[PDB]
């Protein structure tokens, strides 16, 4: 809608207070005009029809518990936009400042979030497995990164290309979490997963096997569930990314870490320059080596570390 840009205040899913960019025109709308062509947050009203209605609020204060998932979806989309712009010189997910849209309160007891090809969508969770999924910045950034992947490499959501697609979302999900400095870690979904149980998460990048995912190519899933294991075999790539950044010794192979910033640079380049819709793990290795070579030279420590990490997880 057309109106006056302003700033409102609200409380997120975890009870934290934050300022959000809104737009005033009779009502205050969750429409952020300060970033690209805008960030728009919608109320799906417990239904499955999308996007629902542009979130309207009478007083520019968002402290109702019904408001919380909208606050976080709106706010964390903004942070994710800032990350891609400031760190990678990318304007929104298409590189041309496309409007970013999210719907919250999708369906009832819905334990999931997704990019549907056009927008992000967040369930409220069932209150047991999940609380509202937009409450996690690594969740929001994971989703938005699916959009980035779709407009760049276009990795098919199936088998090894799908696992790479998933890992890219987990990796940048995590990098965005570190960027915002919000209790950052190498775990996925910890803020919104199992509110009854402390210290756990949905997946782990530092140790994927902790939650049943492979941390070595020899342990990959070869069946047909989960589109050929796209949320399972991603563990292999996630572990490699963890090693490149943090370093460590894994199945007897030692890796010197080069840190988060370079990890991000190398994988962003691979994603945008070298990966294709049907890239497999071995092609990912080649893309990452080539990207590090482009950026730091073929005899750099960076190239060496990328090679050791993929050796460590058994990807040749
Ligand atoms: O597979 C899909 O299309 C949707 C799937 N969604 C999903 O797993 O929702 C929960 C969640 C997402 C990110 C981080 C932690 C938890 C995905 O985006 O991979
Ligand atoms: Ca209000
Ligand atoms: Ca965290
Ligand atoms: Ca996390
Ligand atoms: Ca938990
Ligand atoms: Zn995903």
Experimental technique behind these coordinates = X-ray
Any domain includes 194: yes
Residue finishing a domain among 128, 154, 180: 154
Q: Kindly state if the Cβ of 237 falls inside 6 Å of ligand 1.
A: no
Say if residue 148 is in the same domain as residue 17.
yes
The CATH number given to whatever domain includes residue 191 is: 1.10.390.10
| Cα angle for residues 272, 202, 117 (degrees, 5° grid) | 40
Say if residue 311 is in the same domain as residue 232.
yes
Any domain includes 11: yes
> What is the sign of the dihedral through the CA atoms of 168, 76, 121 and 84?
negative
Say if residue 134 is in the same domain as residue 19.
yes
Question: What DSSP state is assigned to residue 208?
Answer: G
Cα–ligand 1 centroid distance for 112 (angstroms): 6
Any domain includes 1: no
Query: How many folded domains does the chain comprise?
Result: 2
φ/ψ of 61, rounded to 5, equals -120, 130
The answer to whether 128 and 192 are in contact (CB under 8 A) is no
Cα–ligand 1 centroid distance for 236 (angstroms): 17
Say if residue 165 is in the same domain as residue 150.
no
Whether omega for the bond prior to residue 226 falls within 30 degrees of 0, making it cis, is no
Say if residue 83 is in the same domain as residue 192.
no
Say if residue 63 is in the same domain as residue 30.
yes
DSSP string computed for 40-103: EEEE-TTSSSSS-EE-EESSSEE-SGGGHHHHHHHHHHHHHHHHHHHHH---TTTSS---EEEE
The CATH number given to whatever domain includes residue 101 is: 3.10.170.10
Say if residue 192 is in the same domain as residue 238.
yes
Token pair recorded at residue 259: 């840190």
Say if residue 49 is in the same domain as residue 166.
no
Strand order, beta sheet including 4-11: 56-57, 27-29, 17-25, 4-11, 61-62
Q: Kindly state if the Cβ of 70 falls inside 6 Å of ligand 1.
A: no
Say if residue 207 is in the same domain as residue 171.
yes
Say if residue 131 is in the same domain as residue 177.
no
Say if residue 105 is in the same domain as residue 76.
yes
Query: What length does the chain have?
Result: 316
Q: Which domain holds residue 272?
A: 155-315
Say if residue 209 is in the same domain as residue 146.
no
Q: What is the resolution of this structure in A?
A: 2.1
CA-nearest residue for atom 13, ligand 1, is: 139
Burial 6-34 (b: 16+ CB within 10 A, else e): eebebbbbeeeebebbbbeeebbbbbbbe
CA-nearest residue for atom 12, ligand 1, is: 139
């Amino acid at each position: 809608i057309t109106g006056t840009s302003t700033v409102g205040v609200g409380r997120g899913v975890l009870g934290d207070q934050k300022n959000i960019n809104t737009t005033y025109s009779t009502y205050y709308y969750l429409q952020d005009n300060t970033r690209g062509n805008g960030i728009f947050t919608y109320d799906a009203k417990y239904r499955t029809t999308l996007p629902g209605s542009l979130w309207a609020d009478a007083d520019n204060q968002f402290f109702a518990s019904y408001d919380a998932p909208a606050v976080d979806a709106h706010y964390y989309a903004g942070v994710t936009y800032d990350y891609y712009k400031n760190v990678h010189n990318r304007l929104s997910y298409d590189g041309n400042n496309a409007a970013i849209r999210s719907s919250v309160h999708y369906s009832q007891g819905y334990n999931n979030a997704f990019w549907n090809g056009s927008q992000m969508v967040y369930g409220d969770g069932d209150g047991q497995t999940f609380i509202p999924l937009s409450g996690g910045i690594d969740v929001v950034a994971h989703e938005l990164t699916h959009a980035v992947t779709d407009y760049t490499a276009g990795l098919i959501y199936q088998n090894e290309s799908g696992a790479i697609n998933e890992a890219i979302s987990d990796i940048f999900g995590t990098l965005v979490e570190f960027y915002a400095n919000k209790n950052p870690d190498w775990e996925i979904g910890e803020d919104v997963y199992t509110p009854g149980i402390s210290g756990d998460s949905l997946r782990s990048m530092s140790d994927p096997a902790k939650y049943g995912d492979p941390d070595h190519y020899s342990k990959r899933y070869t069946g047909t569930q989960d589109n050929g294991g796209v949320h399972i075999n991603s563990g292999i790539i996630n572990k490699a990314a963890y090693l490149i950044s943090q370093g460590g010794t894994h199945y007897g192979v030692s890796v010197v870490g080069i840190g988060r910033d370079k990890l991000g640079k190398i994988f962003y380049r691979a994603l945008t320059q070298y990966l294709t819709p049907t890239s497999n793990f071995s092609q990912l290795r080649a893309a990452a080596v080539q990207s590090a070579t482009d950026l730091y030279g073929s005899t750099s420590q960076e190239v060496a570390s990328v090679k050791q990490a993929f050796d460590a997880v058994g990807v040749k």
